């Protein structure tokens, strides 16, 4: 009675691929019949394959601030390289051991194909012209307009372009004069309810202005001739030009390389963490502001005795995600879902409770070397100190 067992392989086709992707349109106008070109990069810059999207992965309409497919629907698969979707995307043996070891694979977006739909004056309809793509238009918008990025709505970057005048092109010197005040008042929705430039509530001096190398050279020439030093008083006299980049951020927070709000300061963390709605062993339904709550990591409780010491229940790197979200605007900072479904250890009602939090310029993303699996090298801010008879 003889038993056998065989396995085979090939060191040029040892694996296949399947990429679940989703498209986003964060622009200003819809793009029809979308076919992005995209590339699967292994490691640093070793490209496995470049795939223009085939017929299975075509998005017929992508309105601004919409997704294909919808956010409630599962993403689409890209598993083809042939024009007729008959050939998979493969890997050799050396690209397969490196992918199971390091788990590093990203997906770039080299370009996007898509059509333009224009109004028909005959019957009032809108018809997609399949001979005109958006690649004939975007290199003409990008050379005759100024760009302004602004993140005063839910701390996300909104990019807008405004037609400004180029003084070395005779067709471009016909457009009307664009000032920096007027460019904000028509692109994002500023106003002046008491003679001062304002967002929804905030004065314009609550923001800061960062330019590029070429733009900041031209702004200093405009400020010398106006005999001005502070830019926040001559906002209605700075002429914009073609190919200007201007960045307008909220002054209160910290920004990383991609200009995302990722850190705060020591004073803002006590402004929206003053009042407490309910106080118990389980409930923190607090009025945490939408600015800092996206940039924090979590919360940390601290036991405090009568003589005074430092005892932390959640003294671990992964026991800090205690942030649940209800449907009333108060982010439910639960206490017991990391505590074995058991109530917390309280030995005396004289002992008070102290709760803190950490931002993300002090939050680490990997375990440390020897024994720092805890809050040793994590600096915080004092937030909560009341007597333990008002909470319990």
């Amino acid at each position: 009675r003889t038993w056998a067992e065989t396995m085979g392989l090939n060191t040029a086709d040892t694996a296949r691929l399947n990429a679940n992707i989703r498209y986003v349109n964060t622009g200003t106008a819809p793009i029809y019949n979308v076919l992005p070109t995209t590339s699967l990069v292994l490691g640093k810059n070793q490209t496995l394959a470049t795939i223009k999207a085939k017929e299975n992965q075509l998005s017929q309409i992508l309105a601004p601030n919409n997704y294909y497919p919808s956010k409630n629907l599962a993403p689409i698969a890209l598993n083809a390289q042939d024009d007729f979707s008959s050939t998979p995307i493969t890997m050799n043996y050396n690209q397969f051991l490196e992918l199971e070891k390091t788990k590093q694979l990203r997906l770039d977006t080299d370009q996007v194909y898509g059509n333009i739909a224009t109004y028909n004056f005959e019957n009032g309809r809108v018809r997609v012209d399949t001979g005109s793509n958006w690649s004939e238009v975007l290199p003409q918008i990008q050379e005759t307009t100024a760009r302004i990025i602004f993140n005063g709505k839910d701390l996300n970057l909104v990019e807008r372009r405004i037609a400004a005048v180029n003084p070395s092109d005779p067709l471009e010197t016909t457009k009307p004069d664009m000032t920096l005040k007027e460019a904000l008042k028509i692109a994002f929705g500023f106003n002046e309810p008491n003679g001062n430039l304002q967002y929804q509530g905030k004065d314009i001096t609550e923001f800061d202005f960062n330019f590029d190398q070429q733009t900041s050279q031209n702004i200093k020439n405009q400020l010398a001739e106006l005999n001005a030093t502070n830019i926040y008083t001559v906002l209605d006299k700075i002429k914009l030009n073609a190919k200007m980049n201007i960045l307008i951020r909220d002054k209160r927070f910290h920004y990383d390389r991609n200009n995302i709000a990722v850190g705060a300061d020591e004073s803002v963390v006590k402004e929206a963490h003053r009042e407490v709605i309910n106080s118990s062993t389980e409930g923190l339904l607090l009025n945490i502001d939408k600015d800092i709550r996206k940039i924090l990591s979590g919360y940390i409780v601290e036991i405090e005795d009568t003589e005074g010491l430092k005892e932390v229940i959640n003294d671990r790197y992964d026991m800090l995600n205690i942030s649940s979200l209800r449907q009333d605007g108060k982010t439910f900072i639960d206490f017991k879902k990391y505590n074995d479904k058991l109530p917390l250890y309280i030995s005396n009602p004289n002992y008070k409770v102290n709760v803190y939090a950490v931002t993300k310029e002090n939050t680490i993303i990997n375990p440390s070397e020897n024994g720092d699996t805890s809050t040793n090298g994590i600096k915080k801010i004092l937030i909560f100190s009341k007597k333990g008879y008002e909470i319990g």
């Binding site: 009675r1 989703r22 349109n25 200003t28 106008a29 793009i31 372009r161 994002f188």
Partner: protein, 49 residues
Amino acid sequence: NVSPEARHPLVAAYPIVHVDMENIILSKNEDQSTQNTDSQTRTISKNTS
């Protein structure tokens, strides 16, 4: 579908599209097989010394 702040003449209306990956599903192309065997020999050995 053109957003309402782009209907000023001086503001440009244009899309900004980018693709982001959510899962990578690699499948190891490897073939494998088993086999059984049941041999049954019956010998009739005759000797003449």
